[PDB]
């Protein structure tokens, strides 16, 4: 009975509504990062933990986009027990202590989501809320992460109720992304206007240009340098330890094996 | 320009086929997107992405992990080079005398040196039928020269 | 015991670095779809392409009959359709 | 690009309220904006 009452009051209740998915995902990103960094049976363990962080993040996205408090309850319960049971499978550590710690933060923010509820407006990219410079840089960085952009799109499509196909979902995502980047730039130009016909600031030019040139230098010259440096190192003294002179004389029985060694 | 008209035609055909199939089998206005269709395509894409990052790592580790082929000294050649001028004392043995230590034998050695952690470690870490017995022959007959 | 090298290059960094490089380049390959899908919605979202396939098939018909003067003329239509996006909208209208 | 982000955000709003009929309709606007470059010029005018 009591357990049923607890669960009823964790589902039906009368609480508020917060969106702490951003922070939950950030906790899981930190977790992923430290497990990736913590490659140090061990490779197999770290590879299983990789697949795990990933799978759990995907399930979390599902429950967030489907606004399931009951689903989040179930996931939390399972995950708590499973991660705590993985402490018993230590057989393949500061890295693991930190992984536990950051996963504890994820469990705390997840527990908050369940006990608060899911807010009506869940859609909308976190880094496209304001149109400043920080939002711009963060968004572009998210787009630079190998597969985050595409994963987000496909995943969201699968959960969110749409009439459009993946092709068309990706179209509206691309349009929005580009439009946001343009908006941020437009906003910053309104905030900090540049006089009409004001060169381009010698220093700015020198910086960007210099970096590009140096990057190009490191495409051609640097590899050559590294290559030559490593290959050049050659030469380890090799001296005959012994002087074995066998003066094989007799055709039938070769002898005369008087010879010497290192002392001589 | 030949390639231009070929590209245009190819694209136009693909569009036409899609238009025709939508006329043949129309999709109601505002009818979700069918949960199953989504789950299928999305799932495949995710799995393909999994196989870009995780699968190579798995394969790599699997192959590389396999390591360890027993290597035991076939013979125990103890040449006690004594005489500076003429080094001799070559009484030594071979495989018949050499005894690949069994599991029980290994336990014995490990327990003998159990007090010293690293001593036992050496023995225990080396796999059974690894530690070989140096039963070097001591008898002579070979006079010296 | 002996240890057979089942790596080839270097498990620690050689193969590792190669793996990273592959992932990145596959990254760009996959981006190649979901980045500029919106720069073609003018050549790929045409409502009715029937009038354009007629043009294309007329070029083919005029090459079989070897009246290559009209090949040049019908090619001119094709390139102007694809040089002015507004005329594509007109020509690809669903009904008329 | 203010008028285009409004369109994009309206598609998002209409998917949260699950009125997916209007999703199809607002998607039609998006694709025509990007199918005719001249209408983009009109819609993206600085002032009006």
């Amino acid at each position: 009975p009591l357990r049923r009452f607890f669960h009823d009051i964790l589902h039906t209740k009368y609480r508020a509504a917060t969106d702490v998915y951003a922070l939950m995902f950030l906790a899981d990103v930190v977790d992923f990062i430290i497990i990736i960094f913590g490659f140090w049976q061990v490779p197999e363990a770290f590879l299983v933990m990789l697949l795990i962080q990933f799978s759990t993040m995907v399930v979390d996205r599902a429950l967030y986009l489907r606004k399931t408090v009951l689903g989040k309850l179930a996931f939390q319960v399972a995950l708590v027990l499973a991660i705590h049971l993985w402490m018993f499978f230590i057989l393949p550590n500061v890295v693991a202590q930190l992984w536990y710690f950051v996963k504890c933060i994820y469990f705390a923010l997840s527990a908050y989501q369940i006990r608060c509820g899911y807010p009506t407006r869940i859609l909308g990219n976190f880094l496209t809320k304001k149109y400043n410079h920080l939002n711009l840089f963060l968004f572009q960085g998210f787009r630079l992460v190998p597969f985050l952009v595409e994963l987000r799109a496909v995943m969201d499509w699968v959960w969110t109720d749409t009439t459009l196909s993946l092709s068309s979902w990706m179209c509206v995502e691309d349009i929005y992304a580009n439009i946001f980047i343009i908006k941020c730039s437009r906003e910053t130009e309104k905030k900090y206007p540049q006089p009409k016909g004001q060169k381009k600031k010698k220093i700015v030019k020198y910086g960007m240009g210099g970096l590009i040139i140096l990057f190009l230098i490191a495409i051609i010259w640097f590899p050559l340098l590294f290559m030559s440096l490593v290959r050049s190192v050659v030469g380890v003294v090799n001296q005959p330890i012994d002087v074995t002179v066998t003066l094989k004389l007799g055709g039938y029985e070769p002898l005369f094996t008087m010879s010497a060694q290192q002392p001589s | 320009s030949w390639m231009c008209v070929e590209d245009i035609y190819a694209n136009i055909f693909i569009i036409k086929c899609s238009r025709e199939t939508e006329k043949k089998y129309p999709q109601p206005k505002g009818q979700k997107k069918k949960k199953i269709v989504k789950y299928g395509m999305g799932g495949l894409i995710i799995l393909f992405l999994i196989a870009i990052i995780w699968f190579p790592l798995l394969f790599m580790s699997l192959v590389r992990s396999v390591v360890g082929v027993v290597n035991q000294p076939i013979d125990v050649t103890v040449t006690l080079k004594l005489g500076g001028y003429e080094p001799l004392f070559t009484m030594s043995a071979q495989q018949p005398s050499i005894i690949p230590f069994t599991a029980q034998a290994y336990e014995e050695l490990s327990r003998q040196f159990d007090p010293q952690p690293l001593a036992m470690q050496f023995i225990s870490q080396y796999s059974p039928e690894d530690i070989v017995t140096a039963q070097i022959e001591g008898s002579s007959g070979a006079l010296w020269r | 015991k002996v240890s057979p090298p089942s790596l080839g290059f270097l498990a620690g960094y050689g193969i590792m670095g190669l793996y990273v490089s592959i992932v990145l380049v596959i990254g760009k390959f996959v981006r190649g779809f979901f980045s500029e899908i919106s720069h073609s919605i003018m050549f790929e979202e045409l409502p009715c392409v029937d009038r354009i396939l007629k043009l294309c098939q007329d070029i083919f018909l005029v090459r079989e009959t070897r009246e290559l003067e009209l090949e040049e003329e019908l090619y001119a239509k094709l390139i102007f359709l694809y040089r002015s996006p507004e005329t594509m909208i007109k020509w690809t209208r669903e009904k008329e | 690009v203010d008028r285009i982000l409004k369109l994009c955000q309206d598609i998002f709003l209409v998917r949260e309220t699950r009125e997916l009929e209007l999703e199809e309709e607002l998607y039609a606007k998006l694709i025509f904006l990007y199918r005719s470059p001249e209408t983009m010029i009109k819609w993206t005018r600085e002032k009006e």
């Binding site: 009439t163 | 129309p26 | - | 039609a28 209408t39």
Partner: peptide, 20 residues
């Protein structure tokens, strides 16, 4: 149908009819 309704866009939608 979905197809016809996503391919129905015309210039009249983008006229400036009190777009606030």
């Amino acid at each position: 149908d979905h197809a016809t309704v996503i391919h129905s866009g015309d210039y009249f939608l983008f006229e400036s009819d009190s777009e606030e």
